[model samples]
Target: VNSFSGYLKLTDNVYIKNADIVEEAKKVKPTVVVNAANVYLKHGGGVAGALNKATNNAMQVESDDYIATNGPLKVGGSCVLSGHNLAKHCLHVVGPNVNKGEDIQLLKSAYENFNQHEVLLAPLLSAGIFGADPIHSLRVCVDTVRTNVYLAVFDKNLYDKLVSSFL
Candidate 1:
């Protein structure tokens, strides 16, 4: 466990390299791997799209077509699904559009939803097409989540940055 910013307590956190989200999940075996998406949950591209494909298209179809259960997820909205790939479960959370400017609170809320679980695997929220700063997003991810977190980073530079920051 770690204490940070003088108040927040982190039970554990991990930085993973040389793996995509699904592959990391297979290795770490977290309770849920988060699928970060837009309000529509289209997940047509980026990490969201990759996660969609990894799940055999269930999240996209359900999130897009099955509104009653899977949903039209607004920012700050979320849903949980049975895992289709390596994850034991999938947690879908809608994060702020980084195109609209940084919404760290919205991003934090996205991470916040999964704190109830013992372990969670999450991407860098809003850091991709959403365009939020990765370092900023990394800090938010670390600050908000109290449980064990495995942050999947395929990029070596970003992984290094996160590791250096933690040190």
Candidate 2:
């Protein structure tokens, strides 16, 4: 049923929990996990850092090589997984940094590119250093994603805000 412990239902299809996304995804083993990425796809601190660290930075090599070959991803563009052992694939999408209403559609485009068929798990895109409003990010995810969506949240306050605001 794609259910897990310590998860709170936010919708018929969406779920949330306060946990480190990298660790939780290891256990869930979702078909793929979305990376809130930079245009260069560098494994900098935050979600990408944890993911690259988990794979001993091999994932960064793939991303580095990928950028060398395919070039940098445009904002709202999602990159191929390069076939990492983690969750079958890692969907990398560069999200907009602005918090304006117009910028909200940018994340939606990223979601459209995600298009995972089953057990899609991800973090709040643009909600951190990207500086997009977390609440807007959360709603965009729930509103757009069509698969079984599990949002792995890392903050207690944001987790509570997301759950309470939407539920």
Candidate 3:
């Protein structure tokens, strides 16, 4: 449970504790940039081009290159993992609300892609907008992706979960 702590002042020597990160940001200085209409969005390279960039960098980095939370995975209703398909295989456990069963199913999908010799991208479910209890959320999200019909458990878990029927 990563708790954010801070104080804010509305008057001289008068202060109050902020209950939310957003409120804390307001007390401190924050910036938001969003270009309104008449804005042209350009394609910043689609999947095919992105694949080329990835393949070229594959030898220099591995999936673990990402900054790991360095903590044991948790299982809950929220998340805090910086998952990305470009870095490497990332197991994701999404919240139960977004897409019914998406959290559980995506992990199986990730493992399945791995079996077919596809790169496993990391699963992300953090960033302030993710909503309530990130740790537990991230855990359950990863767990679901790692388990289920595929029998895929990363390692050392006291289970015979198969990565796939092929191996």
> Which tens-of-lDDT digit does each residue in 1-167 have in candidate 1?
32111212233554444347766666655668887777776788878888788768876666766566654766866777666665778787777876876466787787788677777777877777778778787777777877776667767777677666653
lDDT of 1 at 43: 81
Please write out the lDDT profile of model 3 over residues 1-167, one tens digit for every residue.
11213323223221223122222222322221010000011102322123224345441132223223232222322112221222222223222223222243333332232232222222223212223233343343334343211111112221222112111
What shift in Å separates residue 101 of candidate 1 from its native position after superposition?
A: 4.1
Q: lDDT scores for all predictions?
A: 0.70, 0.79, 0.25
Model 1 lDDT, full chain set: 0.70
Ranking by lDDT: 2, 1, 3
Best by lDDT: 2
- In order, what is each prediction's RMSD in angstroms? 5.3, 2.3, 19.2
Candidate closer to the true structure by TM-score (higher is better), 1 or 2: 2
Cα lDDT tens digits, model 2, 83-158, are 3656778888888867433366788887666565566778888887777888998888778877777788899998
lDDT of 3 at 71: 29
Model 2 lDDT at residue 38: 83
